[PDB]
């Protein structure tokens, strides 16, 4: 539906976060409410929380 792209690298020490590379495609699992979103990587297949301000619709 709506695909998002990472705007910056994100590496987290919280293992339930999704870490990702600038340019990687991600998707939202729930909705766009909140500053932290449950997300899924379209490249690694992993699911985890991400900061909303690190991604944009592509």
mmCIF file of N, CA and C in Angstrom:
data_model
loop_
_atom_site.group_PDB
_atom_site.id
_atom_site.type_symbol
_atom_site.label_atom_id
_atom_site.label_comp_id
_atom_site.label_asym_id
_atom_site.label_seq_id
_atom_site.Cartn_x
_atom_site.Cartn_y
_atom_site.Cartn_z
ATOM 1 N N UNK A 1 0.851 -1.197 0.000
ATOM 2 C CA UNK A 1 0.000 0.000 0.000
ATOM 3 C C UNK A 1 0.890 1.252 0.000
ATOM 4 N N UNK A 2 1.257 1.736 1.186
ATOM 5 C CA UNK A 2 2.200 2.846 1.319
ATOM 6 C C UNK A 2 3.551 2.289 1.748
ATOM 7 N N UNK A 3 4.565 2.522 0.944
ATOM 8 C CA UNK A 3 5.921 2.115 1.274
ATOM 9 C C UNK A 3 6.680 3.322 1.799
ATOM 10 N N UNK A 4 7.466 3.119 2.848
ATOM 11 C CA UNK A 4 8.288 4.157 3.439
ATOM 12 C C UNK A 4 9.765 3.883 3.152
ATOM 13 N N UNK A 5 10.553 4.943 3.118
ATOM 14 C CA UNK A 5 12.002 4.848 2.962
ATOM 15 C C UNK A 5 12.679 5.476 4.183
ATOM 16 N N UNK A 6 13.756 4.841 4.626
ATOM 17 C CA UNK A 6 14.567 5.374 5.711
ATOM 18 C C UNK A 6 15.352 6.587 5.236
ATOM 19 N N UNK A 7 15.274 7.673 5.988
ATOM 20 C CA UNK A 7 15.978 8.915 5.652
ATOM 21 C C UNK A 7 17.388 8.984 6.231
ATOM 22 N N UNK A 8 17.664 8.208 7.282
ATOM 23 C CA UNK A 8 18.957 8.194 7.942
ATOM 24 C C UNK A 8 19.202 6.786 8.453
ATOM 25 N N UNK A 9 20.467 6.448 8.656
ATOM 26 C CA UNK A 9 20.798 5.206 9.338
ATOM 27 C C UNK A 9 20.228 5.219 10.760
ATOM 28 N N UNK A 10 19.735 4.063 11.211
ATOM 29 C CA UNK A 10 19.254 3.920 12.587
ATOM 30 C C UNK A 10 19.782 2.616 13.160
ATOM 31 N N UNK A 11 20.669 2.719 14.149
ATOM 32 C CA UNK A 11 21.168 1.576 14.904
ATOM 33 C C UNK A 11 20.743 1.735 16.360
ATOM 34 N N UNK A 12 20.101 0.719 16.889
ATOM 35 C CA UNK A 12 19.586 0.778 18.238
ATOM 36 C C UNK A 12 20.173 -0.315 19.104
ATOM 37 N N UNK A 13 20.346 -0.002 20.393
ATOM 38 C CA UNK A 13 20.728 -1.035 21.342
ATOM 39 C C UNK A 13 19.522 -1.725 21.984
ATOM 40 N N UNK A 14 18.302 -1.356 21.603
ATOM 41 C CA UNK A 14 17.085 -2.036 22.030
ATOM 42 C C UNK A 14 16.743 -3.071 20.973
ATOM 43 N N UNK A 15 16.761 -4.335 21.354
ATOM 44 C CA UNK A 15 16.682 -5.404 20.356
ATOM 45 C C UNK A 15 15.302 -5.571 19.749
ATOM 46 N N UNK A 16 14.251 -5.048 20.367
ATOM 47 C CA UNK A 16 12.933 -5.018 19.754
ATOM 48 C C UNK A 16 12.745 -3.833 18.829
ATOM 49 N N UNK A 17 13.730 -2.945 18.729
ATOM 50 C CA UNK A 17 13.723 -1.947 17.671
ATOM 51 C C UNK A 17 14.149 -2.601 16.371
ATOM 52 N N UNK A 18 13.683 -2.038 15.285
ATOM 53 C CA UNK A 18 14.184 -2.361 13.964
ATOM 54 C C UNK A 18 15.297 -1.380 13.650
ATOM 55 N N UNK A 19 16.495 -1.884 13.446
ATOM 56 C CA UNK A 19 17.580 -1.051 12.939
ATOM 57 C C UNK A 19 17.575 -1.136 11.413
ATOM 58 N N UNK A 20 18.074 -0.086 10.757
ATOM 59 C CA UNK A 20 17.928 -0.019 9.307
ATOM 60 C C UNK A 20 18.911 0.974 8.727
ATOM 61 N N UNK A 21 19.088 0.855 7.409
ATOM 62 C CA UNK A 21 20.022 1.662 6.635
ATOM 63 C C UNK A 21 19.263 2.746 5.895
ATOM 64 N N UNK A 22 19.852 3.931 5.820
ATOM 65 C CA UNK A 22 19.328 4.966 4.949
ATOM 66 C C UNK A 22 19.070 4.404 3.555
ATOM 67 N N UNK A 23 17.841 4.588 3.056
ATOM 68 C CA UNK A 23 17.422 4.075 1.775
ATOM 69 C C UNK A 23 16.637 2.790 1.836
ATOM 70 N N UNK A 24 16.687 2.092 2.964
ATOM 71 C CA UNK A 24 15.925 0.867 3.120
ATOM 72 C C UNK A 24 14.428 1.158 3.165
ATOM 73 N N UNK A 25 13.653 0.264 2.581
ATOM 74 C CA UNK A 25 12.213 0.367 2.547
ATOM 75 C C UNK A 25 11.603 -0.339 3.751
ATOM 76 N N UNK A 26 10.603 0.308 4.330
ATOM 77 C CA UNK A 26 9.924 -0.148 5.529
ATOM 78 C C UNK A 26 8.439 0.079 5.336
ATOM 79 N N UNK A 27 7.638 -0.586 6.180
ATOM 80 C CA UNK A 27 6.198 -0.456 6.133
ATOM 81 C C UNK A 27 5.683 -0.389 7.567
ATOM 82 N N UNK A 28 4.562 0.256 7.764
ATOM 83 C CA UNK A 28 3.982 0.331 9.098
ATOM 84 C C UNK A 28 3.029 -0.834 9.364
ATOM 85 N N UNK A 29 3.084 -1.349 10.582
ATOM 86 C CA UNK A 29 2.226 -2.466 10.971
ATOM 87 C C UNK A 29 0.877 -1.999 11.505
ATOM 88 N N UNK A 30 0.843 -0.907 12.250
ATOM 89 C CA UNK A 30 -0.392 -0.454 12.885
ATOM 90 C C UNK A 30 -0.971 0.753 12.162
ATOM 91 N N UNK A 31 -0.400 1.928 12.370
ATOM 92 C CA UNK A 31 -0.893 3.191 11.821
ATOM 93 C C UNK A 31 0.219 4.215 12.028
ATOM 94 N N UNK A 32 -0.037 5.454 11.624
ATOM 95 C CA UNK A 32 0.949 6.524 11.693
ATOM 96 C C UNK A 32 0.780 7.411 12.923
ATOM 97 N N UNK A 33 -0.009 6.977 13.898
ATOM 98 C CA UNK A 33 -0.129 7.704 15.155
ATOM 99 C C UNK A 33 1.049 7.357 16.049
ATOM 100 N N UNK A 34 1.576 8.366 16.725
ATOM 101 C CA UNK A 34 2.670 8.211 17.660
ATOM 102 C C UNK A 34 3.991 8.634 17.053
ATOM 103 N N UNK A 35 4.970 8.790 17.928
ATOM 104 C CA UNK A 35 6.329 9.097 17.520
ATOM 105 C C UNK A 35 7.192 7.863 17.342
ATOM 106 N N UNK A 36 6.742 6.710 17.819
ATOM 107 C CA UNK A 36 7.410 5.431 17.605
ATOM 108 C C UNK A 36 6.387 4.463 17.034
ATOM 109 N N UNK A 37 6.733 3.843 15.895
ATOM 110 C CA UNK A 37 5.825 3.009 15.132
ATOM 111 C C UNK A 37 6.369 1.591 15.066
ATOM 112 N N UNK A 38 5.483 0.612 15.204
ATOM 113 C CA UNK A 38 5.844 -0.752 14.862
ATOM 114 C C UNK A 38 5.951 -0.872 13.346
ATOM 115 N N UNK A 39 7.084 -1.367 12.883
ATOM 116 C CA UNK A 39 7.375 -1.366 11.463
ATOM 117 C C UNK A 39 7.981 -2.693 11.034
ATOM 118 N N UNK A 40 8.084 -2.868 9.715
ATOM 119 C CA UNK A 40 8.581 -4.086 9.103
ATOM 120 C C UNK A 40 9.492 -3.703 7.954
ATOM 121 N N UNK A 41 10.657 -4.323 7.898
ATOM 122 C CA UNK A 41 11.566 -4.079 6.786
ATOM 123 C C UNK A 41 11.222 -4.905 5.553
ATOM 124 N N UNK A 42 11.120 -4.229 4.422
ATOM 125 C CA UNK A 42 10.907 -4.899 3.137
ATOM 126 C C UNK A 42 12.181 -5.501 2.569
ATOM 127 N N UNK A 43 13.294 -5.380 3.273
ATOM 128 C CA UNK A 43 14.556 -5.968 2.847
ATOM 129 C C UNK A 43 15.050 -7.082 3.753
ATOM 130 N N UNK A 44 14.944 -6.928 5.066
ATOM 131 C CA UNK A 44 15.385 -7.958 5.986
ATOM 132 C C UNK A 44 14.250 -8.832 6.485
ATOM 133 N N UNK A 45 13.004 -8.390 6.337
ATOM 134 C CA UNK A 45 11.854 -9.128 6.810
ATOM 135 C C UNK A 45 11.559 -8.993 8.283
ATOM 136 N N UNK A 46 12.354 -8.226 9.014
ATOM 137 C CA UNK A 46 12.220 -8.106 10.460
ATOM 138 C C UNK A 46 11.167 -7.067 10.831
ATOM 139 N N UNK A 47 10.604 -7.232 12.015
ATOM 140 C CA UNK A 47 9.604 -6.351 12.608
ATOM 141 C C UNK A 47 10.135 -5.765 13.910
ATOM 142 N N UNK A 48 9.882 -4.483 14.128
ATOM 143 C CA UNK A 48 10.306 -3.838 15.362
ATOM 144 C C UNK A 48 9.940 -2.385 15.335
ATOM 145 N N UNK A 49 10.141 -1.741 16.474
ATOM 146 C CA UNK A 49 9.790 -0.335 16.580
ATOM 147 C C UNK A 49 10.832 0.558 15.895
ATOM 148 N N UNK A 50 10.344 1.660 15.339
ATOM 149 C CA UNK A 50 11.208 2.672 14.699
ATOM 150 C C UNK A 50 10.721 4.048 15.074
ATOM 151 N N UNK A 51 11.622 5.036 15.061
ATOM 152 C CA UNK A 51 11.197 6.432 15.245
ATOM 153 C C UNK A 51 10.563 6.974 13.968
ATOM 154 N N UNK A 52 9.403 7.607 14.115
ATOM 155 C CA UNK A 52 8.633 8.046 12.964
ATOM 156 C C UNK A 52 9.367 9.115 12.170
ATOM 157 N N UNK A 53 10.239 9.869 12.825
ATOM 158 C CA UNK A 53 10.922 10.956 12.168
ATOM 159 C C UNK A 53 12.113 10.476 11.364
ATOM 160 N N UNK A 54 12.356 9.170 11.286
ATOM 161 C CA UNK A 54 13.430 8.652 10.448
ATOM 162 C C UNK A 54 12.961 8.113 9.106
ATOM 163 N N UNK A 55 11.663 8.190 8.783
ATOM 164 C CA UNK A 55 11.149 7.595 7.555
ATOM 165 C C UNK A 55 10.196 8.550 6.845
ATOM 166 N N UNK A 56 9.980 8.313 5.550
ATOM 167 C CA UNK A 56 9.049 9.092 4.763
ATOM 168 C C UNK A 56 8.418 8.195 3.718
ATOM 169 N N UNK A 57 7.182 8.480 3.303
ATOM 170 C CA UNK A 57 6.620 7.753 2.153
ATOM 171 C C UNK A 57 7.536 7.900 0.955
ATOM 172 N N UNK A 58 7.685 6.821 0.202
ATOM 173 C CA UNK A 58 8.567 6.866 -0.946
ATOM 174 C C UNK A 58 7.805 6.905 -2.259
#
